[PDB]
């Protein structure tokens, strides 16, 4: 059981080993709809570097539809300001390569290649509730 608030695994690979099971074996519910994830979504949850949410010692993930939906709502709600990557580097005194930026549509962390694309196409990064986001390749092409 995961009824200890502090000492339960946070990332899906850890939960796999903690339940002595593999990502190919495990079945999980989405935290909003409590519907079961498709295996394709489970993989993507691992690839998106998201955290397991726990209620009463039960683990919950997030499916694709819910994640995109709540992210889009969060964009509409807590948008702050948009800066060029170059300007952003100066505000944080670090190169964009190192700065933590996630996909605004699907939370996947942005690769340095995608970060470069933002600089190449003179596109801005959006501050939402105090965290920075951009658009990954799979969301700038759709």
């Amino acid at each position: 059981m995961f009824q200890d608030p502090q000492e339960r695994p946070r990332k899906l690979p850890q939960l796999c080993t903690e339940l002595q099971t593999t990502i190919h074996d495990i079945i999980l519910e989405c935290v909003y709809c409590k519907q079961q994830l498709l295996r394709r979504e489970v993989y993507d949850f691992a690839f998106r570097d998201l955290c397991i949410v726990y209620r009463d010692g039960n683990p919950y993930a997030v499916c694709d539809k819910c994640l995109k939906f709540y992210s889009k709502i969060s964009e509409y709600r807590h948008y702050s300001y948009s800066l060029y990557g170059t300007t952003l580097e100066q505000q944080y005194n670090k190169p964009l390569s190192d700065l933590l930026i996630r996909c605004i549509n699907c939370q996947k962390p942005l690769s340095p290649e995608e970060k470069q694309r933002h600089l190449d196409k003179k596109q801005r990064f959006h501050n939402i509730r105090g965290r920075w986001t951009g658009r990954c390749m799979s969301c700038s092409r759709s």
Partner: protein, 681 residues
């Protein structure tokens, strides 16, 4: 006698020779061949007094003045290249010397410099890297007030000159002019020098930023990310405030009043919808004056804030629609309050609290009020009436929440209030809603309250408004030169009146009745007593009030754009009463027109009124004796004909600012009836 760098002594070699040969051209050759070179200047000296002596000697000759001007015009465009492409300051931190040398020239503000030389120099200077600006600002903060005034004036004249000389319109924006933008960035550099040069109190006055927890949906997304404890991130902070380590809010008293940094000509020309857009979305080719808030007047700032509020209200409306499309749930796009005239405080509390607990984001919707039993569309008049009722009810001494001072006509929190922290939260929310909906409220708080709302504790000096009988007494105690212990016999214990009039003894320090106040501890006692009256006596109530207010303003640029003195203006409105502007915007109904004899006589009378009669006239026609943000010209007053000549007094509808005026037969009768109405109301 060619030389690569210059000094006072080297200059003197020529002063004498030029006088002796009755010439100036050699010294002009020299000064030109010097001051056209950035390197020569950077290498020449920091020797402020030497520079000052040199300028005081050289600028005495007209021929040499034109040479300085002509050298500066040559110098600056090259310096811009060094800073923009070669990062020279990162190779030699002495490069800043150049600007220090030039700025000590007293004649930079004469028109000959304003037209070309100073603009170019501003373009160069405004490109300095932040660390260099921080070095320069820290130096300027040691200058005399008149010198800050001179530097401020040097750029103010330039911004004024360029705004007046160029034709700006919706296609040619002030935001597209490099000269004004560069000048503004320079002026910003002076502004922070004025801030840092003032009195700054950072170690005894900070209050914690209390944030309302977001709705469960955002919480889950924050939990799905690694942000469970990272709820506190602050608003958009100015890079210079970060580099200097001092906020605009930290300076208790500047060298030059902040109001003198407001450039009214610029404010008359600036289009705020586009500026707010450039503030929100960074574009490489356009600037935003909201990044330089000190230059904007309260009207212009409020218009920016109003765009923020409206854009958010509209975002919440989009979210409402999106929720309805994906999950079928029907949410109200307005903050619809329904209340009974006999239970306004209770109904408003339960509703706003259920809303704040179920969904704290709902408080950011557009306000819409409905009195249970009444029927009308809330175009703001019903809301205004709701605010009047709430404010009147909350300040009634029978509710015991506030104490009213007859002397200052200001309200202050009752320390002895048994009423629940709910009512204090409600009044806090009401203030927020008023700013959010641009409605002026007839609330009368001393400056300490607005400081506490911004997160600064009230200090001894703030008693000067809230408790004059107290402030004076404490000031007297500080000024006294005898043995405080033997002469005043006061201890670390004070007396406070309960609702039932009983004196409650409060110990400022443990067993305070046994601890005497001595000359060495009196300043501490004053700090503690001030801290008790301004904080620790009302802290229970005030903390609730402040929470209520932040529930509406937590994400607003308010903390960045405004100061306590300007918050008051947003909530209560201005004390300046321009009746000419009121005449220009007044509308006429019932068959009156601007060319009607009675209307012309009305304006002759109203212009001849005293300021007190004018305040009474506004109170009568509008329900408040203050003018909205931007003056009386923003008040859409309507003079509506209330029948032919009669013995009746005029009447008013304060919820819509309508004056029901009979068509009197004479100017004297109009004056006498109008004076009587506004005096006896």
């Amino acid at each position: 006698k060619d030389v690569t760098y210059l000094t006072e002594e080297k200059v003197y070699e020529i002063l004498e020779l030029c006088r002796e040969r009755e010439d100036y051209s050699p010294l002009i050759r020299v000064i030109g061949r010097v001051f056209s070179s950035a390197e020569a200047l950077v290498q020449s000296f920091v020797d402020i007094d030497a520079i000052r002596r040199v300028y005081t000697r050289l600028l005495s000759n007209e021929k040499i003045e034109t040479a300085f001007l002509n050298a500066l015009v040559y110098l600056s465009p090259n310096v811009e290249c060094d800073l923009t492409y070669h990062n020279v300051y990162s190779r030699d931190p002495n490069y800043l010397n150049l600007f220090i040398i030039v700025m000590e020239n007293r004649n930079l503000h004469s028109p000959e410099y304003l037209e070309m030389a100073l603009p170019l120099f501003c373009k160069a200077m405004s490109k300095l890297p932040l660390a260099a600006q921080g070095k320069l600002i820290r130096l300027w903060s040691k200058y005399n007030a008149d010198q800050i005034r001179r530097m401020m004036e040097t750029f103010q004249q330039l911004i004024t000159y360029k705004v007046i000389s160029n034709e700006f319109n919706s296609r040619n924006l002030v935001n597209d002019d490099d000269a004004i933008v560069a000048a503004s960035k320079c002026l910003k550099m002076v502004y922070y020098a004025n801030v840092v040069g003032g009195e700054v109190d950072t170690n005894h006055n900070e209050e914690d930023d209390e944030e309302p927890i977001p709705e469960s949906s955002e919480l889950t997304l924050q939990e799905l990310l690694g942000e469970e404890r990272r709820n506190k991130k602050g608003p958009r902070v100015d890079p210079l405030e970060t580099e200097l380590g001092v906020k605009t809010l930290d300076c208790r008293k500047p060298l030059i009043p902040f109001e003198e940094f407001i450039n009214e000509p610029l404010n008359e020309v600036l289009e705020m919808d586009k500026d707010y857009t450039f503030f929100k979305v960074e574009t490489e080719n356009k600037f935003s004056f909201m990044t330089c808030p000190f230059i904007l007047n309260a009207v212009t700032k409020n218009l920016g804030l109003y765009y923020d509020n409206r854009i958010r209200m509209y975002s919440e409306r989009r979210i409402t629609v999106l929720y309805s499309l994906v999950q079928g749930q029907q949410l109200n796009p307005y903050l619809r309050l329904k209340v009974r005239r006999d239970h306004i405080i209770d109904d408003a509390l339960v509703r706003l609290e259920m809303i704040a607990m179920e969904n704290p984001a709902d408080l950011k919707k557009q306000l819409y009020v409905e009195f249970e039993g009444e029927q009308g569309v809330d175009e703001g008049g019903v809301s205004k009436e709701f605010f009047q009722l709430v404010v009147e009810e909350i300040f009634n001494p029978d509710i015991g929440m506030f104490t009213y001072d007859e002397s200052t006509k200001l309200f202050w929190f009752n320390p002895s209030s048994f009423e629940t922290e709910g009512q204090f939260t409600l009044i806090g929310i009401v203030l927020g809603l008023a700013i959010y909906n641009n409605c002026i409220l007839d609330v009368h708080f001393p400056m300490v309250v607005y400081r506490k709302l911004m997160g600064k504790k009230g200090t001894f000096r703030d008693l000067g408004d809230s408790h004059p009988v107290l402030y004076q007494s404490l000031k007297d105690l500080l000024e006294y030169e005898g043995n405080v212990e033997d002469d005043m016999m006061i201890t670390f214990q004070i007396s406070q009146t309960d609702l039932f009039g009983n004196p409650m003894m409060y110990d400022l320090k443990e067993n305070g009745d046994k601890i005497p106040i001595t000359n060495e501890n009196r300043k501490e006692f004053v700090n503690l007593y001030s801290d008790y009256i301004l904080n620790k006596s009302v802290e229970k109530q005030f903390k609730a009030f402040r929470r209520g207010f932040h529930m509406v303003t937590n994400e607003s640029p308010l903390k960045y754009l405004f100061r306590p003195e300007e918050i008051e203006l947003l909530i209560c409105g201005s004390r300046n009463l321009d009746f000419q502007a009121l005449e220009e915007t007044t509308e006429y109904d019932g068959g009156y027109t601007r060319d009607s004899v009675l209307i012309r006589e009305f304006w002759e009378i109203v212009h001849s009124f005293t300021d007190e009669q004018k305040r009474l006239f506004l109170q009568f026609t509008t329900g408040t004796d203050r003018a909205p943000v931007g003056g009386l010209g923003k008040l859409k007053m309507i003079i509506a004909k209330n029948g032919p000549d009669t013995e009746r007094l005029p009447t008013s509808h304060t919820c819509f600012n309508v004056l029901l005026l009979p068509e009197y037969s004479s100017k004297e009768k109009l004056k006498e009836r109008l004076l009587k109405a506004i005096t006896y109301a």
